[PDB]
Write a protein that binds this ligand. Structure first.
Ligand SMILES: NC(=O)c1ccc[n+]([C@@H]2O[C@H](COP(=O)([O-])OP(=O)(O)OC[C@H]3O[C@@H](n4cnc5c(N)ncnc54)[C@H](O)[C@@H]3O)[C@@H](O)[C@H]2O)c1
Ligand SMILES: NC(=O)c1ccc[n+]([C@@H]2O[C@H](COP(=O)([O-])OP(=O)(O)OC[C@H]3O[C@@H](n4cnc5c(N)ncnc54)[C@H](O)[C@@H]3O)[C@@H](O)[C@H]2O)c1
Ligand SMILES: NC(=O)c1ccc[n+]([C@@H]2O[C@H](COP(=O)([O-])OP(=O)(O)OC[C@H]3O[C@@H](n4cnc5c(N)ncnc54)[C@H](O)[C@@H]3O)[C@@H](O)[C@H]2O)c1
Ligand SMILES: NC(=O)c1ccc[n+]([C@@H]2O[C@H](COP(=O)([O-])OP(=O)(O)OC[C@H]3O[C@@H](n4cnc5c(N)ncnc54)[C@H](O)[C@@H]3O)[C@@H](O)[C@H]2O)c1
Ligand SMILES: [Cl-]
Ligand SMILES: [Cl-]
Lengths: 268, 268, 268, 268
């Protein structure tokens, strides 16, 4: 089977990753789990810590002591940690799946550099469903062309501070690019009063903020006689964990390089 | 059976009214149809003109010519026309259903003045479903109270000039009044950038403009653990015609006065 | 403030109840938390156990030792436990909110008996949104009458063994009763092949089983020209916890008796 | 401009085709309109008959009379009629768009035989959105694989006789073929009682019959953490007419052969 290590294992995503690894059924197995060296959770069973049954893998504090018991490392931590993990995995010639965000430009260049020596999957969004939708949106925009009005409707919980969501904006950009438009020029984010007849080129954003919604995204393509909607509904962050594990498996037998979920899903 | 006349019978709502009347299964029947005396369609069968089979009712040009041949007049024309229609019905002591919009405050007083002598149903919206939703919203808002975020999502076709719709704003007003809020003070019509966390008092409007959508309206009430949605979808203007016909039957036996659809539907 | 005890505090619902109590903001406060006497969690902070900050209330093993530090007891345990709690609360003249399910008929009679001496809220479903929807459905069915086709669409996760859900069936019964129909006679649960034109009286159930869906419920009322949909979407069991806490507060100053959520919500 | 003739011009699709042709912004124009020689509508303007302004094209009764006045014939009539239409177009060497349904396997061979001499677009469904969705479904199914539960939810009006729709079954077949399943073996059309936990291979159909719904189709792909939905909503039969007109323009310059909408839309 595929031997998978998880670093940041005691974290929110790390716990989800442990779970998604066990849910592959002998395709993969957890062989290592690493968190902070100064963590009082060090020594505890990684399975128990994630709310699962006892797996038989203790939480350890140093990737170096276990750096040879795995085939691939999945990393959802913090840039300063991932850089150190990159170093150890590169030296040990082990593949990586990196979900950590917030890398600086210089920190990013290190990723491509390490990708000379090891195969890496690096993605800002590991959701299989979201990445699939991004491809479907490109196909739909190209087929439907300038016949349709395109509107992006999203809902998120009452605590979200940014609107529209990063995902909605990305969907907007996919559509804009497919139709040769500049999103920033044609985007509308609200409507109040006498707005007038809709321009065909407009990409409209209707944004709902309410309750505890994890994240709903719909792109509507509407013309006379018909509507097409492509919709993603998230219920938890397990979607990112499952996509990371898929990436970890996909990496088996792959040439050195820097890949993303479009590669993993065969959508590029 | 109930003898129904339709004025503005060649118009958009007029044609729908003819169809809605004929569809009553024999409870009612069309006995007169009037449009402009100006009309080139004068003489043509009312059924044929509405795309139905021949009904046996020619399109008349003068309400006065057929004044003594109907129990109730349904009027979807124009304020100037209705004000004249009213005086004729008032003198002939005939009941009216008035769907015409755009009356001044003074003219409404004139309608009421006439309603002293005849029963009249006068409503800004004759859709049974929309008026029902207005009542359901008041109930929902009172029960859920300040615990929920309330968002009003609507979609209309690409040629609609005003946003949010009059129906969406009315839904807004119903919820605001139930919760003791000033809609103008708490309404939000768009979201862009760092809007920050949502204030509970906010009534948000997310408005979609696209394709040929006749009119979709949803009110979302959201809190931790659950969403409640009250939704109306219009497929054609037949919804208003059917509601007007329901009013015309309801008027039978009613004492003089000025009524609305909340009276007709018993929602008051 | 309102002093609230929670029994079954270490359980799934008990943990949610602790959380919903703290989320009232001085309207209520947790003063006691009881679970199994033989629990090794006894002594631990009820707040910490539920994943919250330290509340200052230890988990105890016996309601009797604390039976006077609270105004109302919320109980989500098991019938054999609740019966004992009923006894202690009755003697101490303390109100109760009972969410425990699975009572036998004889066990139920004890509830009504205790309700001679104390005020009790007892409900099979403590969700405010679901109970609200049940009332809205009655209003809608009565207003729309035999003009509409009524269809109940629900979705639940891939592990649910019963179809349609208990909630969908209850919604079906509300509608059936409102229109004077027998649900069992008019219900349809699937459609395959040449089913023919739809009978107006039919109440249709379209049931989706997929993924991890917690529970979506929609009642569609459809006629020519329009659709009305009343929809409840659950995201977690916190909805039941929040409704129980509302009941606990509602009980303040109430006469002895047996109440349900229709009373709490003022919908009866 | 492209010279388009419509046969069955007085029919339901015929009228829609006339409108769709006139709406092309001058890319195309109607030059002939044929219905039964039997027709009482013979002589009437094609625009007027379709509820449009006078177009200047009288309804003809014989395809042979106008055989040399169009580049492409759009045919939505009846198999017996189309088989004759084909031989005339074949001899006049005129391209065809055939929307007529209900051909035998032998007659399809005859269509192909004719397609040896003229270019023909022949499709069971001319909606651009529906055909697009068929392609998106194949992509979605291949990417998501055996990880998801796949459910097909559709709604149609109260007079539709067959369930699920032909479009829903086709969507079922697309997904089944992508995943190497036998649709007949894995399809489920209803759920009642203790159905038990869902098998992953199952393709579920939840079918709604209600009101005047022209046709809503949704395919849900669900797994832990996320739902993906691909949705088509038809508002009128204009969707098929617009697609047929797109095909008629696409045919310009095409070599002889038998084409479908996957060719027209480049989805192959
Ligand atoms: N790409 C995606 O799809 C996606 C999705 C969700 C989150 N993220 C990113 O994943 C990262 C983690 O998110 P989280 O919410 O899981 O944060 P979190 O803080 O819950 O978990 C982070 C873990 O890193 C551990 N950690 C810190 N220093 C360490 C070290 N030196 N060695 C090992 N472990 C160490 C912390 O102890 C903690 O357990 C963030 O960058 C977040 O943006 C990416
Ligand atoms: N209350 C509602 O629910 C509702 C819904 C839709 C429309 N409306 C209102 O209905 C009215 C008409 O709507 P429409 O879209 O049918 O417009 P329309 O212009 O198609 O119909 C107007 C008809 O009135 C006829 N008319 C004009 N002067 C006349 C006269 N002196 N005597 C007789 N007929 C005369 C015109 O010839 C035309 O046929 C507008 O005020 C619109 O706002 C109300
Ligand atoms: N009415 C509703 O809306 C609603 C909603 C959800 C669950 N429920 C009902 O709530 C009950 C609990 O559900 P759960 O899923 O929370 O089960 P759970 O088993 O997670 O929690 C039950 C708790 O009861 C505790 N318990 C057992 N014996 C006890 C005793 N003698 N004294 C004190 N505590 C004791 C157990 O230790 C456990 O912590 C069940 O009857 C379930 O059907 C009702
Ligand atoms: N492929 C698609 O996407 C699609 C969509 C809708 C309908 N259809 C098919 O289109 C066909 C017609 O659909 P409709 O609903 O428009 O039916 P319809 O009967 O309204 O139209 C039929 C028309 O054909 C005319 N006709 C009959 N014999 C004729 C002849 N010998 N010469 C000329 N005209 C003649 C009739 O007079 C009538 O006007 C059916 O086969 C239907 O299945 C296909
Ligand atoms: Cl109500
Ligand atoms: Cl694709």
């Amino acid at each position: 089977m595929r031997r998978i290590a998880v670093v940041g294992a005691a974290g929110r995503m790390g716990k989800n990753l442990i779970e998604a690894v066990q849910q592959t059924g002998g395709a993969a197995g957890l062989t290592a789990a690493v968190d902070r060296p100064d963590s009082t959770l060090v020594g505890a069973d990684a399975g128990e810590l994630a709310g699962l049954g006892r797996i038989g893998v203790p939480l350890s504090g140093d990737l170096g002591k276990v750096c040879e018991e795995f085939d691939v490392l999945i990393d959802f931590t913090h840039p300063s940690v991932t850089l150190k993990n990159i170093e150890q995995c590169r030296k040990a010639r082990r593949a990586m799946v990196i979900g950590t965000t917030g890398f600086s430009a210089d920190e990013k260049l290190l990723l491509a550099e390490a990708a000379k020596d090891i195969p890496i999957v690096f993605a800002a969004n590991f959701s299989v469903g979201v990445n699939l939708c991004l491809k479907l949106l490109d196909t739909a925009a190209r087929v439907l062309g300038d016949e349709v009005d395109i509107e992006i409707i999203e809902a998120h919980h009452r605590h979200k501070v940014d609107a529209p969501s990063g995902t909605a904006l990305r969907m907007g950009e996919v559509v804009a690019q497919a139709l040769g438009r500049d999103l920033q020029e044609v985007a509308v984010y609200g409507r109040e009063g006498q707005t007038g007849a809709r321009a065909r080129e407009t990409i409209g954003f209707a944004t709902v903020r309410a309750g505890d919604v994890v994240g709903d995204h719909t792109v509507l393509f509407a013309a006379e006689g018909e509507r097409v909607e492509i919709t993603h509904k998230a219920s938890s962050r397990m979607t990112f964990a499952r996509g990371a594990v898929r990436a970890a498996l996909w990496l088996e037998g792959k040439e050195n390089g820097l890949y993303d979920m479009q590669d993993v899903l065969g959508l590029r």
